[PDB]
A and B are shown apart, each in its own frame.
Chain A
Amino acid sequence: MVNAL
């Protein structure tokens, strides 16, 4: 799960 950047 990548961050929302």
Chain B
Amino acid sequence: GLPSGASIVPLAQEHIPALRRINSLLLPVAYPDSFYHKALDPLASGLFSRAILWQDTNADPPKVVGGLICRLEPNPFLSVTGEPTPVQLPADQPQRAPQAPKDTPFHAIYIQSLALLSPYRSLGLAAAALDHIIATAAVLPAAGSNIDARTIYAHVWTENEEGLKWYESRGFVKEGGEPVKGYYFKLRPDTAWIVRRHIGESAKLNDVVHHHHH
């Protein structure tokens, strides 16, 4: 059950100014405006993105207190026949996503940003948003979608214990045996873990970790 006053909704244009402010406060990577425009494009990051809203009293319009911006991608953790596989991280492209097999039928949901203002923490709100995303992925095929989302993943800065703990508590695992070097352009250190959770028809693979990569 959500705490009184909270709601979770698909991310919409009216939420972007506030979510951008929240990200600016809580995430030490400055995103360009294009990042937020793409978050409104169902073909870019405008399908699985969610706003976390709060109303102090029933007289107040709900306000954005957090959110997840997400992007659909080809799945880089599975073979084209569904086996778990070590990730491929081309050495000349560390700032790029792990490389998925060509023409895979499987998808991943990539969490580009996750943030929640501190007064609203420890209430299960971000976990509820994640569960809403997972449930959306589960019902999309029955709605006629060609999306087959088998994994959710993110990059987590190696200094961000708050984030690492959340992802671990939500059932994600560190993949590849080491963080990605040179992932961030300006942050020091520039390293980020790839964390991933297999879901849906692949949920039974969630505990199959590869402690190396290609």
Contacts of B156 in A (CB 8 A): 1
Chain A residue with Cβ nearest B31:
A4
Contact with A along B32-71 (1 / 0, CB 8 A): 1001000000000000000000000000000000000000
- Do A5 and B113 touch across chains, with their CB atoms under 8 A apart? no
Contacts of B114 in A (CB 8 A): 1
Interface centre among A2, A4, A5 (most CB of B within 10 A): A2
Residues from 86 to 145 in B contacting A, C-beta threshold 8 Å? 95-96, 110, 112-114
Could you tell me the distance between the alpha carbons of A2 and B183 in the complex, rounded to whole angstroms? 9
Contact of A5 among B27, B28, B95, B154 (CB under 8 A): B95
- Do A2 and B32 touch across chains, with their CB atoms under 8 A apart? no
Contacts of A2 in B (CB 8 A): 29, 110, 112-113, 154-155
Number of CB contacts from chain A to chain B under 8 A: 35
- Do A3 and B155 touch across chains, with their CB atoms under 8 A apart? yes
| Consensus secondary structure, chain A interface | loop
- Do B27 and A1 touch across chains, with their CB atoms under 8 A apart? yes
Contacts of B112 in A (CB 8 A): 1-2
Contact of A3 among B160, B163, B185 (CB under 8 A): B185
14 extra interface residue pairs, beta carbon distance < 8 Å, beyond A1-B27, A1-B29? A1-B28, A1-B113, A1-B114, A1-B154, A1-B156, A1-B157, A1-B163, A1-B192, A2-B110, A3-B95, A3-B155, A3-B185, A3-B192, A4-B31
A/B interface sample: 22 pairs, CB < 8 A: A1-B27, A1-B29, A1-B112, A1-B113, A1-B114, A1-B156, A1-B157, A1-B163, A2-B29, A2-B110, A2-B113, A2-B155, A3-B95, A3-B155, A3-B185, A3-B192, A4-B29, A4-B30, A4-B35, A4-B185, A5-B95, A5-B96
